[PDB]
Design a binder for these strands. Structure first.
Ligand SMILES: [K+]
Ligand SMILES: [K+]
Ligand SMILES: [K+]
Ligand SMILES: [K+]
Ligand SMILES: [K+]
Ligand SMILES: [K+]
Ligand SMILES: [K+]
Ligand SMILES: [K+]
Ligand SMILES: [K+]
Ligand SMILES: [K+]
Ligand SMILES: [K+]
Ligand SMILES: [K+]
Ligand SMILES: [K+]
Ligand SMILES: [K+]
Ligand SMILES: [K+]
Ligand SMILES: [K+]
Ligand SMILES: [K+]
Ligand SMILES: [K+]
Ligand SMILES: [K+]
Ligand SMILES: [K+]
Ligand SMILES: [K+]
Ligand SMILES: [K+]
Ligand SMILES: [K+]
Ligand SMILES: [K+]
Ligand SMILES: [K+]
Ligand SMILES: [K+]
Ligand SMILES: [K+]
Ligand SMILES: [K+]
Ligand SMILES: [K+]
Ligand SMILES: [K+]
Ligand SMILES: [K+]
Ligand SMILES: [K+]
Ligand SMILES: [K+]
Ligand SMILES: [K+]
Ligand SMILES: [K+]
Ligand SMILES: [Mg+2]
Ligand SMILES: [Mg+2]
Ligand SMILES: [Mg+2]
Ligand SMILES: [Mg+2]
Ligand SMILES: [Mg+2]
Ligand SMILES: [Mg+2]
Ligand SMILES: [Mg+2]
Ligand SMILES: [Mg+2]
Ligand SMILES: [Mg+2]
Ligand SMILES: [Mg+2]
Ligand SMILES: [Mg+2]
Ligand SMILES: [Mg+2]
Ligand SMILES: [Mg+2]
Ligand SMILES: [Mg+2]
Ligand SMILES: [Mg+2]
Ligand SMILES: [Mg+2]
Ligand SMILES: [Mg+2]
Ligand SMILES: [Mg+2]
Ligand SMILES: [Mg+2]
Ligand SMILES: [Mg+2]
Ligand SMILES: [Mg+2]
Ligand SMILES: [Mg+2]
Ligand SMILES: [Mg+2]
Ligand SMILES: [Mg+2]
Ligand SMILES: [Mg+2]
Ligand SMILES: [Mg+2]
Ligand SMILES: [Mg+2]
Ligand SMILES: [Mg+2]
Ligand SMILES: [Mg+2]
Ligand SMILES: [Mg+2]
Ligand SMILES: [Mg+2]
Ligand SMILES: [Mg+2]
Ligand SMILES: [Mg+2]
Ligand SMILES: [Mg+2]
Ligand SMILES: [Mg+2]
Ligand SMILES: [Mg+2]
Ligand SMILES: [Mg+2]
Ligand SMILES: [Mg+2]
Ligand SMILES: [Mg+2]
Ligand SMILES: [Mg+2]
Ligand SMILES: [Mg+2]
Ligand SMILES: [Mg+2]
Ligand SMILES: [Mg+2]
Ligand SMILES: [Mg+2]
Ligand SMILES: [Mg+2]
Ligand SMILES: [Mg+2]
Ligand SMILES: [Mg+2]
Ligand SMILES: [Mg+2]
Ligand SMILES: [Mg+2]
Ligand SMILES: [Mg+2]
Ligand SMILES: [Mg+2]
Ligand SMILES: [Mg+2]
Ligand SMILES: [Mg+2]
Ligand SMILES: [Mg+2]
Ligand SMILES: [Mg+2]
Ligand SMILES: [Mg+2]
Ligand SMILES: [Mg+2]
Ligand SMILES: [Mg+2]
Ligand SMILES: [Mg+2]
Ligand SMILES: [Mg+2]
Ligand SMILES: [Mg+2]
Ligand SMILES: [Mg+2]
Ligand SMILES: [Mg+2]
Ligand SMILES: [Mg+2]
Ligand SMILES: [Mg+2]
Ligand SMILES: [Mg+2]
Ligand SMILES: [Mg+2]
Ligand SMILES: [Mg+2]
Ligand SMILES: [Mg+2]
Ligand SMILES: [Mg+2]
Ligand SMILES: [Mg+2]
Ligand SMILES: [Mg+2]
Ligand SMILES: [Mg+2]
Ligand SMILES: [Mg+2]
Ligand SMILES: [Mg+2]
Ligand SMILES: [Mg+2]
Ligand SMILES: [Mg+2]
Ligand SMILES: [Mg+2]
Ligand SMILES: [Mg+2]
Ligand SMILES: [Mg+2]
Ligand SMILES: [Mg+2]
Ligand SMILES: [Mg+2]
Ligand SMILES: [Mg+2]
Ligand SMILES: [Mg+2]
Ligand SMILES: [Mg+2]
Ligand SMILES: [Mg+2]
Ligand SMILES: [Mg+2]
Ligand SMILES: [Mg+2]
Ligand SMILES: [Mg+2]
Ligand SMILES: [Mg+2]
Ligand SMILES: [Mg+2]
Ligand SMILES: [Mg+2]
Ligand SMILES: [Mg+2]
Ligand SMILES: [Mg+2]
Ligand SMILES: [Mg+2]
Ligand SMILES: [Mg+2]
Ligand SMILES: [Mg+2]
Ligand SMILES: [Mg+2]
Ligand SMILES: [Mg+2]
Ligand SMILES: [Zn+2]
Lengths: 155, 50, 87
RNA sequence: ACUGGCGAGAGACCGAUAGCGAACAAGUACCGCGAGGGAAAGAUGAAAAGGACUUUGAAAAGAGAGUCAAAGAGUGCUUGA
RNA sequence: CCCGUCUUGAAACACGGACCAAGGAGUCUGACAUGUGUGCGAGUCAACGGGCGAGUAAACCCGUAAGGCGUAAGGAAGCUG
RNA sequence: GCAAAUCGUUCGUCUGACUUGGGUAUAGGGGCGAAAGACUAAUCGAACCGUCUAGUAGCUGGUUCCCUCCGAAGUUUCCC
RNA sequence: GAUGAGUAGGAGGGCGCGGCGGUCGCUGCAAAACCUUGGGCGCGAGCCUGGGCGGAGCGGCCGUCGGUGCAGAUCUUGGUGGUAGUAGCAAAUAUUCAAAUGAGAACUUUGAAGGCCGAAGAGGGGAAAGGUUCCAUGUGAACGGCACUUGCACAUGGGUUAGUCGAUCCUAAGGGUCGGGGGAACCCCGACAGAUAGCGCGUCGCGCGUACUCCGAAAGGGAAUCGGGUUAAAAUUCCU
RNA sequence: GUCUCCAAGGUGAACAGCCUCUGGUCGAUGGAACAAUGUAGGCAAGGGAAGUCGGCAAAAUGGAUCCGUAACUUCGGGAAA
RNA sequence: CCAACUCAGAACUGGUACGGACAAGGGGAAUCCGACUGUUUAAUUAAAACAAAGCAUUGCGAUGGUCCCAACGGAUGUUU
RNA sequence: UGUCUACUAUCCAGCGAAACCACAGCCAAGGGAACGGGCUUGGCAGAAUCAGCGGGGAAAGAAGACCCUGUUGAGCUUGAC
RNA sequence: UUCACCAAGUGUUGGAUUGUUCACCCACCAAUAGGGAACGUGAGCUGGGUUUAGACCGUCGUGAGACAGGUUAGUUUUACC
RNA sequence: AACGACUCUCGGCAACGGAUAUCUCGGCUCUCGCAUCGAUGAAGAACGUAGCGAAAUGCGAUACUUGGUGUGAAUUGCAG
């Protein structure tokens, strides 16, 4: 409905969103953080390389305990990165949906770039796990809302 | 068990009948607040106590 | 062994369903309901449990016969007559 | 005389964590071998007029469009710290 | 130097406190007392009840040897005052 | 923690005061005890449930708006 | 004209919340609540106002009343963080290849291979206990602590057939009772204080007659069923 | 944790252990690396309890056949000395 | 004519290996305690603690000893 | 002391808790509630991050069970009443 | 060999008995000096002792029980901040 | 010591959550009227019952109702 940020030129922009997606919020934020201000064509190939374990998504904020890899040194010097395929899959579907919206609007798909993308925490879902001495603890999931906007690159 | 009294079997039959979803047309009545069957029972989760 | 292992032996029923009150409270060996004291002629009631009294007191059930007494009282328990046929 | 029953009127009383435990399929769901223990849970709109159709997706759904004074009221939906 | 707290002494290597919302503790009643306001005054008090009355739980009226407190005290008491 | 007593190896006994199912009897100052104050439904040097009960506490904790004014005591005597 | 410290404590004058008796007003030309890097007043409690949101109530003043003011109580209920994408997924020897199906296959199905349980079994039944978990078809979500096309999940429908298998009958330890004896009564003892129950034979009569015709075993005692065949799911029960 | 019925072949004294047939099953989330520390299982020159409160732990012994077997003794045993 | 599997011995033979895996006592000289088998603090004590046969003492011949019970009655007692 | 095997740890995909938390987290001396992360005086001091580690945080777990106090109990005993 | 000076750079051991600290002896050695660091050091171990509940002896107490007397058996938790 | 990451911080928007405001076929309190359970089987318990219903409410194989009387055109989520 209403996105946190509005495109500068509504006529030259398309958008898509997803709500209550069953994917870890922290992993998806890192993936989104790596795609901001990126051309649509490069973003799609970049996410496909993540699914192929050829390029890594750097982890900058929610990175405690994350392993170190050479595939992330170009974007993140200290080398912390991962390959969150599940987050990449949801974002890839959103990019394709936004691209189809561009075609209906007759935009130049070759010049589109990610002008806005953010991940918000959705309602937590509840399971439980069993602990020693007959105790029950929460076993929660952290789904997220995702919204993105693609804008044409103005000359 | 296989060996069961008539009385117990009759009670179990009634519990099976009550363990169904509400009809869909119930939620379309005027001034309806029944959202679902709040007394659903699963044989493995909650026991009948008899 | 007093804990989890002991809970494994739970296949003998102390109480069954009471013929009178319907609770799973009929102690089999005592032949006595712990909830209503069946087969004792009088029901089991104690003033030290207000909640227990109101769970089982009159009006909590169907009042199959008692619900119609007030209506019959208003007519002075009239019987053996009918309204005059409509004209 | 009368905190039960049935009927009736009233109040400088409470206003959904309050007021009876219970404003709602509450002495219900659920727990206990048992005596017993015992919750949570009210509010779309004046009217369902509850979102046709197009397009993307395996689907959920999104984008556009439509209803409405209002979807910045879209079936746990007034307001929304 | 971190607030709250007990303490001769707290920034304390004394205890409570992860954070936010809402709830959360000198009250009602009986007796008595000092003080103050008000009415009347050697009187005062409509208090049980009655007569009524905003068609009325209020307000208004009623104390005829009623009653309470005060108007006289001392004594264990008989008594005197 | 797989587990509010389990797992691994190692160990006691194994025709008897042997092991075990079901039925049945004994109930709270009571039962039952080859006796450890053991056991009596994860509760036992007195079970569990409701009530008396908002039990009492010279003891611990807390005790909610603002300015303004006055402003202490740890000393006396008596008190299981 | 003088003067200004203050814990425990006392008192005064004020601020704020919700009603009531009055009075003066505001509001769909936008009330309450809430939001704001708008502005201002008061030593302060607080107050006034701009803008926004919201869409139907509200406020000032006098008097009067009260379940009337929170940072704490290992306070109550609800919500939410850091911890942290961290601890962690490790017993029970083990999987591999091809093809099919599917949007999607390390996890479904078929076939092939390689292993395990190794008859005191990880095989085939039953008693308790459970109660539809049984069978077929289908499936959005949730759940099966990875995943699933999967299912002991969810939805719809189907399924348990006895003269011979059991219960039923008998009595065991024991249980529940009449009468009687106790007991304010709830209750206690339990055939022990007593005109037993009735049975048998003739056809209503004769004979006999010791106070329970009761409950108590799906492992004790005990009338009678065997092959062969049959279902998606039943059988010593259906068919022959 | 929870009662009970049926019970194949080989080895062997043996419903011991080990392997197999009938029947069942590969159900325990997977992938890649092979650091420390750990858990479980092992081995080790020469010495042989110097370790340690203490031989804790581990090692050694182990089946069968023949020979042989002391003190002590309640005359039975000790003894598989 | 038909037989099953126990025992004993001999020759030959292998890198002295052979209960080849599996399985399956370490042994001896003494002191303390308890005779022994048995039992015990379920979830920190398995023992020298409890029990035990044996030994000894005590009460009692039923109008009784010991014990239960509010009362009536009852357990030992189908006993001596 | 060395070394070998398996499973962990380790890295990845998916999934994903809890204890604990006034605020926080480099030191020396000083003074101080006599043993400071904060105060005084000095030493110093350079983003973000990984695997380990048990010095410190007088670490966590629990309103000390020891001891004392209370005109609080309770089990048990007897020449206490 | 003794006394004293500068001097803490390096070293100060293997064992029997005891839970020990301490001590004592055997042996080696250049030498077998003395001390601190929360009587350094238990989320480092160990648990022999001490110091819960079982049990025995002696003495004490009418008894329940007592003993800086002896004896034997007695769960050592958590780091990922 | 730029840029960027990270941390903190301020603002806009978006989330998370359900406070506040306005409501209320409920509760609480006071007052009044009435006197009516059952062997002629009560209260309570169980099972069944609708064209499509599990619960609640109603009912009893005549089973969300029969009959009489009153009212005078519906019931309603759908179907008929
Ligand atoms: K890492
Ligand atoms: K409530
Ligand atoms: K709205
Ligand atoms: K304090
Ligand atoms: K203190
Ligand atoms: K503190
Ligand atoms: K007078
Ligand atoms: K009068
Ligand atoms: K006198
Ligand atoms: K054995
Ligand atoms: K008791
Ligand atoms: K005191
Ligand atoms: K007003
Ligand atoms: K403002
Ligand atoms: K007021
Ligand atoms: K069975
Ligand atoms: K039959
Ligand atoms: K039988
Ligand atoms: K027999
Ligand atoms: K047949
Ligand atoms: K390792
Ligand atoms: K040694
Ligand atoms: K034995
Ligand atoms: K006797
Ligand atoms: K992972
Ligand atoms: K210091
Ligand atoms: K006690
Ligand atoms: K440590
Ligand atoms: K031991
Ligand atoms: K910023
Ligand atoms: K922000
Ligand atoms: K409200
Ligand atoms: K009846
Ligand atoms: K019904
Ligand atoms: K009618
Ligand atoms: Mg790690
Ligand atoms: Mg677990
Ligand atoms: Mg458990
Ligand atoms: Mg179960
Ligand atoms: Mg129950
Ligand atoms: Mg117990
Ligand atoms: Mg029983
Ligand atoms: Mg019976
Ligand atoms: Mg009344
Ligand atoms: Mg309530
Ligand atoms: Mg409120
Ligand atoms: Mg409205
Ligand atoms: Mg809303
Ligand atoms: Mg002090
Ligand atoms: Mg302080
Ligand atoms: Mg200090
Ligand atoms: Mg304290
Ligand atoms: Mg704290
Ligand atoms: Mg508040
Ligand atoms: Mg006065
Ligand atoms: Mg007078
Ligand atoms: Mg005189
Ligand atoms: Mg496991
Ligand atoms: Mg008794
Ligand atoms: Mg025993
Ligand atoms: Mg003892
Ligand atoms: Mg209680
Ligand atoms: Mg005195
Ligand atoms: Mg002053
Ligand atoms: Mg106000
Ligand atoms: Mg702000
Ligand atoms: Mg005001
Ligand atoms: Mg009020
Ligand atoms: Mg209050
Ligand atoms: Mg608060
Ligand atoms: Mg305070
Ligand atoms: Mg708190
Ligand atoms: Mg809480
Ligand atoms: Mg949390
Ligand atoms: Mg991990
Ligand atoms: Mg593990
Ligand atoms: Mg693995
Ligand atoms: Mg395994
Ligand atoms: Mg598998
Ligand atoms: Mg095996
Ligand atoms: Mg095998
Ligand atoms: Mg067998
Ligand atoms: Mg899953
Ligand atoms: Mg199935
Ligand atoms: Mg189901
Ligand atoms: Mg038969
Ligand atoms: Mg008998
Ligand atoms: Mg009886
Ligand atoms: Mg009688
Ligand atoms: Mg007789
Ligand atoms: Mg009979
Ligand atoms: Mg019978
Ligand atoms: Mg039989
Ligand atoms: Mg079958
Ligand atoms: Mg053989
Ligand atoms: Mg064998
Ligand atoms: Mg060696
Ligand atoms: Mg050697
Ligand atoms: Mg040797
Ligand atoms: Mg030694
Ligand atoms: Mg040594
Ligand atoms: Mg050993
Ligand atoms: Mg010997
Ligand atoms: Mg001797
Ligand atoms: Mg012995
Ligand atoms: Mg035992
Ligand atoms: Mg033990
Ligand atoms: Mg033991
Ligand atoms: Mg002797
Ligand atoms: Mg008597
Ligand atoms: Mg320092
Ligand atoms: Mg500190
Ligand atoms: Mg400084
Ligand atoms: Mg730094
Ligand atoms: Mg440390
Ligand atoms: Mg560690
Ligand atoms: Mg602390
Ligand atoms: Mg304390
Ligand atoms: Mg304490
Ligand atoms: Mg006290
Ligand atoms: Mg005192
Ligand atoms: Mg006492
Ligand atoms: Mg030196
Ligand atoms: Mg030694
Ligand atoms: Mg010292
Ligand atoms: Mg020390
Ligand atoms: Mg330490
Ligand atoms: Mg330790
Ligand atoms: Mg130590
Ligand atoms: Mg020790
Ligand atoms: Mg001891
Ligand atoms: Mg003595
Ligand atoms: Mg010891
Ligand atoms: Mg109805
Ligand atoms: Zn009953």
């Amino acid at each position: 409905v209403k996105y946190s940020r509005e495109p500068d030129n509504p006529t030259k922009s398309c958008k898509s969103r997803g709500s209550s997606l069953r994917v870890h919020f922290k992993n998806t934020r890192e993936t989104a953080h790596a795609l901001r201000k990126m051309p649509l064509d490069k973003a799609k190939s970049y996410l496909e390389d993540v699914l192929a374990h050829k390029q890594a998504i750097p982890f900058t904020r929610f990175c405690r305990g994350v392993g170190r890899t050479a595939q992330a040194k170009n974007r993140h010097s200290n080398g912390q990165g991962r390959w969150p395929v599940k987050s990449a899959g949801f974002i890839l579907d959103l990019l394709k949906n936004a691209e189809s919206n561009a075609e209906v609007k007759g935009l130049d798909v070759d010049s589109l770039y990610i002008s806005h993308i953010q991940v918000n925490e959705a309602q937590k879902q509840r399971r439980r796990t069993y602990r020693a001495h007959g105790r029950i603890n929460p076993y929660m999931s952290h789904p997220c809302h995702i919204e993105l906007i693609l804008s044409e690159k103005e000359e | 068990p296989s060996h069961k009294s008539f009385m117990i079997k009759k009670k179990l039959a009634k519990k099976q009948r009550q363990n169904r979803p509400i009809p869909y047309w119930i939620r379309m009545r005027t001034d309806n607040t029944i959202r679902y069957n709040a007394k659903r029972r699963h044989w493995r989760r909650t026991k009948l106590g008899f | 062994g007093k804990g989890t292992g002991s809970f494994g032996k739970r296949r003998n029923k102390t109480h069954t369903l009471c013929v009178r009150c319907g609770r799973r409270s009929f102690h089999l060996q005592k032949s006595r309901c712990s909830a209503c004291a069946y087969p004792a002629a009088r029901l089991r009631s104690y003033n030290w449990s207000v909640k227990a009294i109101r769970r089982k007191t009159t009006g909590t059930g169907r009042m199959r016969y008692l619900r119609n007494v007030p209506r019959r009282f208003k007519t002075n328990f009239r019987e053996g007559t009918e309204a005059a046929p409509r004209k």
